[PDB]
Amino acid sequence: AIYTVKALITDPIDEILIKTLREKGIQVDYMPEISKEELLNIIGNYDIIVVRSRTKVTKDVIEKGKKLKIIARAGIGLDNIDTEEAEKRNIKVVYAPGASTDSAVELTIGLMIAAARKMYTSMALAKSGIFKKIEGLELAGKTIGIVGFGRIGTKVGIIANAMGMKVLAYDILDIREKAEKINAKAVSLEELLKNSDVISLHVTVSKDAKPIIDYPQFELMKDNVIIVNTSRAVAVNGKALLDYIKKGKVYAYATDVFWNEPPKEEWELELLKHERVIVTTHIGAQTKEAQKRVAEMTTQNLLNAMKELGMI
Amino acid sequence: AIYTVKALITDPIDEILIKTLREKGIQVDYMPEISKEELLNIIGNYDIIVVRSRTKVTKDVIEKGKKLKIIARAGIGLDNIDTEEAEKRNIKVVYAPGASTDSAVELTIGLMIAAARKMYTSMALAKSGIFKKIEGLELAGKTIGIVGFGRIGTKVGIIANAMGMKVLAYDILDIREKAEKINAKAVSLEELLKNSDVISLHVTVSKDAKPIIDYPQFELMKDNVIIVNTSRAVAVNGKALLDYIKKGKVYAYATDVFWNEPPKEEWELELLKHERVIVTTHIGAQTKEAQKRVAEMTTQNLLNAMKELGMI
Ligand SMILES: NC(=O)c1ccc[n+]([C@@H]2O[C@H](COP(=O)([O-])OP(=O)(O)OC[C@H]3O[C@@H](n4cnc5c(N)ncnc54)[C@H](O)[C@@H]3O)[C@@H](O)[C@H]2O)c1
Numbered sequence A, B: 001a002i003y004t005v006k007a008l009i010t011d012p013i014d015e016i017l018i019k020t021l022r023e024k025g026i027q028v029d030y031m032p033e034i035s036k037e038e039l040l041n042i043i044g045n046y047d048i049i050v051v052r053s054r055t056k057v058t059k060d061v062i063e064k065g066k067k068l069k070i071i072a073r074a075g076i077g078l079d080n081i082d083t084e085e086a087e088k089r090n091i092k093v094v095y096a097p098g099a100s101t102d103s104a105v106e107l108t109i110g111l112m113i114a115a116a117r118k119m120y121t122s123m124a125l126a127k128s129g130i131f132k133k134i135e136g137l138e139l140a141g142k143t144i145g146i147v148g149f150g151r152i153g154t155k156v157g158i159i160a161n162a163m164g165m166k167v168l169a170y171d172i173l174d175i176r177e178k179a180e181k182i183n184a185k186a187v188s189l190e191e192l193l194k195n196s197d198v199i200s201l202h203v204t205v206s207k208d209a210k211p212i213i214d215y216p217q218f219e220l221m222k223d224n225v226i227i228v229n230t231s232r233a234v235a236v237n238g239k240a241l242l243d244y245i246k247k248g249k250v251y252a253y254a255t256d257v258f259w260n261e262p263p264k265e266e267w268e269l270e271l272l273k274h275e276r277v278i279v280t281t282h283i284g285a286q287t288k289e290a291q292k293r294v295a296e297m298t299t300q301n302l303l304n305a306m307k308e309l310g311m312i
């Protein structure tokens, strides 16, 4: 008989993906609020599982999914998927890598300027009917250090250069020529830290790895440095950060990511309430355009994987 | 006998200017809080007057200043000086034109991104301990229309181009080649309005002139347009703006300038409180660097004027 391929969608997702699968005759079971327990009870009946972030595709879930051939994550990352277990089972894992680059780049520049100019303080004052001027720092002519020169880091550098800033970049990978191409200069982390007025973090690091910006790095920094982070909170030693903010060394820390969102620990709470700390609620990929690309890319990558498997 | 040249400083100003004059033997009377009335009583004894913004150098003040030879405005504009009367009296007027360009450019980019991404709303939520994501708009690939292609407008265009935006520009003056040089295209205001996703105002207009962005222009605009203004409030018809924001056509209005700061009129108040309106408290030139340049430039221009007069 003819195989009837079955897909399970466990979280609320863009209708484009569901519509695309249904149009092609694929049996799609949309259970956006399926419980942990019920998932384990039925995962064994599916060839494809589509998840966003609420659902965790752990090792035990994959083991139970004896028919799983494709795991689709409608997102820009795979932190909720056991990629190692998936590979062992030879299960294709697809998602939307790089789908939000420009949106993250733009928020980075926005945070840098908001931090440098105390825009939040000014906007709050304005809304209250108090039009009192507030003084900040100019960026042109200053040096920015891009830590993590990938998709996002490279573009932030191109923009900062256009803003008249001198761009320095550090990456564990070879970026000598890539940096030169955008009028930037690849240097050691030490040189970047000692010479940057603004430091922007755009690295990919694991959750259990030690922070890249720790005590020694903070000590190497210039006085009144502005630090921007739209990558990962763990890349920074939060306690060291609070220490250096209280010492008056760090002019401002602008971030779209927090160790805990919302904060729960005492030191995290102290950072959040500090006037030198600027925080957005992890909206780096939150634009209509980026979210549409996430859906389209996840859908297209899923279709390609299905075609390679001979399903369509 | 030898002329002893006398200078009157009527407002609190950067000590660099006062120190420079004193070092050169010039008689400097620093009266940062001198009243209107007292000013008129003694202005006739001075060759030079230095003002910032509190003091108004009106026609009657100049007439009384029978010995006035130089009027110095420690600022980026001359709205508090009767330049016409000054010219008739052949009185040299100096200040710091263009001194805050990069700071204004940076705030413009910051406002554009903050408006596009509802950064204020997100930051307010974060500070309250509510880390709820908010969706905005991406800028890359979209078209920005620079109205007023001068010092600031040109640089905003260079930066927007680096952000991957298509840049269009309109100016009453010839800018065909200037625009082309930065990968932008000079067009009519009509074409700019019909094709821009973002419109940034950087024009120099008088207080009694009709707004450049009035009803016909708002009608020509694209749906969901983002309008940024760091130039002058009067360049925009505020009532028409409120009308189009309420209609849902304008996605957001981000400005560093308001018709009245703080607002006093009912319609102004309605605009200020609207969620689609983003406002900073006229901090465009408020950076340590820009303010230092204002002082240095005003001081240097004052010295040059004095030298031409044979005073030093
Ligand atoms: N706030 C948001 O909503 C949002 C949106 C998209 C991406 N991000 C994050 O932004 C970061 C960058 O994403 P990207 O697409 O540019 O990734 P990328 O893979 O293109 O680039 C990451 C770079 O950082 C480098 N790197 C890793 N460890 C490093 C270290 N210790 N020192 C210096 N460089 C190091 C890599 O070698 C690489 O060149 C990631 O952490 C990503 O998850 C956040």
Ligand SMILES: NC(=O)c1ccc[n+]([C@@H]2O[C@H](COP(=O)([O-])OP(=O)(O)OC[C@H]3O[C@@H](n4cnc5c(N)ncnc54)[C@H](O)[C@@H]3O)[C@@H](O)[C@H]2O)c1
Pocket (backbone or CB within 6 Å): B076, B077, B098, B100, B101, B104, B147, B148, B149, B150, B151, B152, B153, B170, B171, B172, B173, B202, B203, B204, B205, B212, B230, B231, B232, B256, B257, B282, B283, B284, B285, B286
């Ligand atoms: N928010 C702030 O603190 C702050 C700081 C600095 C300057 N500004 C303001 O920003 C504006 C621009 O300053 P700038 O130094 O770039 O001035 P500029 O003189 O260099 O440029 C102004 C340009 O706008 C043009 N223009 C005038 N009327 C126009 C019209 N109707 N249509 C199209 N173009 C027109 C001019 O011809 C000129 O090219 C001014 O209004 C200035 O006062 C505000």
